Design a protein around this ligand. Structure first.
Ligand SMILES: [Mg+2]
Ligand SMILES: [Mg+2]
Lengths: 167, 167
């Protein structure tokens, strides 16, 4: 199985190609943030909409949401010699039809892109100012239709990144 | 809350300090791999030991297993303005007493360190040969006591990284 190789190969897939970055990020760093953001968004959505979401399937889907970018950058070798318990879980993630999980991860993906733009602008990267504005405007519109995104915005995105890191 | 800031700040925490690396890895890349390895190990352990493990708590624990390294490198600002649903989940991860989850993540942590050594040696880094041998010897001993680690070894660690990436 090439599954473990693909997990580490994601470090070789860059993002934001064509734009100058003070910090070049890869898909593994991006997917790490999307997992964490997906879980936070899901907890907020659970309380606001009065529900419980299966966070196992959500976190696993966010974990592999850009796994196809090892081929197409930014499916038969995965299951080779793979046991039935791993192939079933991998098939459920790869052939997901849970629209709510897809929506949360898509929102988390947009939040991460906006966070990346905030960090670059914070570093002094004027080339990301227009990217931050477009991603921020689209995010503001999403907060009008998804209350859990507005809650996330009020909790973290009002001062990001932190002025003084007092942990 | 500094939670989101800390998630991205983990990119600034290096690993393997004092050793030459062809690819300097950070804690976010490392934690991404540990999450994926923890889930794979858990599925194998479930089938071999005849059980079901709560993968939500496992994945979340692996997600934040090195979150304390934003201060100590390689707790009151986290809960500031944090809602009760997020503080409870964060407290459960930070104050975990599930010994099985801790053991799986500790094993996944050792597997990732060995995988990193394999990649560096594969790149041609002779300085990681002795590290790979020590990590490999300790892993071989663990396979004698934990059958799910031996299964993982047979599935992925016999040819890692892949000679020819045929995806
Ligand atoms: Mg993505
Ligand atoms: Mg670790």
């Amino acid at each position: 199985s090439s599954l473990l190789d693909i997990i580490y190969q994601l470090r070789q897939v860059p993002r934001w190609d064509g734009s100058f970055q003070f910090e070049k990020e890869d898909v593994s760093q991006h997917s790490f943030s999307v997992i964490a953001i997906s879980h936070i968004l899901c907890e907020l959505k659970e309380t606001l909409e009065g529900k419980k979401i299966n966070k196992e399937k959500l976190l696993l889907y966010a974990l592999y949401h850009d796994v196809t970018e090892v081929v197409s950058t930014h499916k038969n070798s995965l299951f080779d010699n793979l046991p039935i318990t791993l192939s079933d879980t991998l098939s459920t993630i790869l052939n997901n039809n849970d629209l709510e999980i897809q929506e949360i991860v898509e929102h988390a993906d947009h939040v991460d892109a906006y966070c990346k733009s905030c960090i670059e602008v914070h570093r002094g990267n004027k080339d990301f100012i227009s990217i931050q504005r477009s991603l921020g405007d689209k995010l503001d519109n999403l907060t009008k239709e998804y209350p859990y995104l507005k809650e996330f915005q009020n909790l973290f995105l009002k001062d990001f990144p932190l002025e003084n890191k007092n942990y």
